[PDB]
Amino acid sequence: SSINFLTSDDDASAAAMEAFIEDTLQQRLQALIESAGENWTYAIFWQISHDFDSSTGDNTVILGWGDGYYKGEAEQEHRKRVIRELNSLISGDEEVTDTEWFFLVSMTQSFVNGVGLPGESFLNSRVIWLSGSGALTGSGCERAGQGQIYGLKTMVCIATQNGVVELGSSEVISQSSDLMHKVNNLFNF
Ligand SMILES: [Ca+2]
Ligand SMILES: [Ca+2]
Q1: Which ligand sits closest to the CA of 8?
Q2: Which helix (H) or strand (E) holds 50?
Q3: Ligand 2 mean position to 138 CA, how many Å?
């Protein structure tokens, strides 16, 4: 089935981590990109938590997988991919494309406030809009770089009250005046 089932709530990141080695966010994420006039590949929502660093402090804000929705549009690599997909569904055939895979592996990732596109975005309450391959590879952010490797040409992070909405596409997409307001309605309240 579609990969949108493995994302929601299971403390999904833990699952993803060992596999790879407010609500419903999802429906709102789904509405967001379904409710849009550019071909977005996926939306993810990065949620805020707190860590407490060893041996010092530390009230450290951290962004982590909240949820996400994936619209969409070698053979060794592929066996590896389906294996982990079959694992993650298990805990707890059809081809696995680059964007699908990037979407899944994102479940394993987190960001110290101020660091990476999601952390920079949240720290400064910022919209960061990277459009075009050179925009991603020139960004100095390893997630943007990783996204570009997997075929993305647009990656966006928008700071919201509870976290950061991320949009990505394999197309070059300019910032729509309407798409920003939808993010307000769906993610701030
Ligand atoms: Ca969640
Ligand atoms: Ca490849």
Answers
A1: 1
A2: strand 42-52
A3: 20
Number of CB atoms found within 10 A of residue 110's CB: 16
Residue among 26, 61, 67, 71 nearest 45 (CA):
67
Tell me how far the alpha carbon of residue 138 lies from the centroid of ligand 1, in angstroms. 31
Nearest 5°: phi and psi at 186?
-85, -15
The C-alpha angle with vertex 70 and arms to 33 and 75, in degrees rounded to 5, equals: 145
For ligand 1, the distance from its centroid to the CA atom of residue 83, given in whole angstroms, is 23
Secondary structure of 56-79 as H, E, C letters: CCCEEEEEEEEEEEECCCCHHHHH
Dist CA 24 CA 11 (whole Å)? 14
Residue 144 contacts residue 155 (beta carbons within 8 Å): yes
44 alpha carbon to ligand 2 midpoint, in Å?
22
How does DSSP classify residue 54? T
How far is the CA of 144 from the CAs of 55, 132, 163, in angstroms?
A: 32, 11, 18
Q: How far is the CA of 128 from the centre of ligand 2 (A)?
A: 26
Tell me which ligand sits closest to the C-alpha of residue 75: 2
Resolution in A: 2.1
Closest ligand to C-alpha of residue 11 is 1
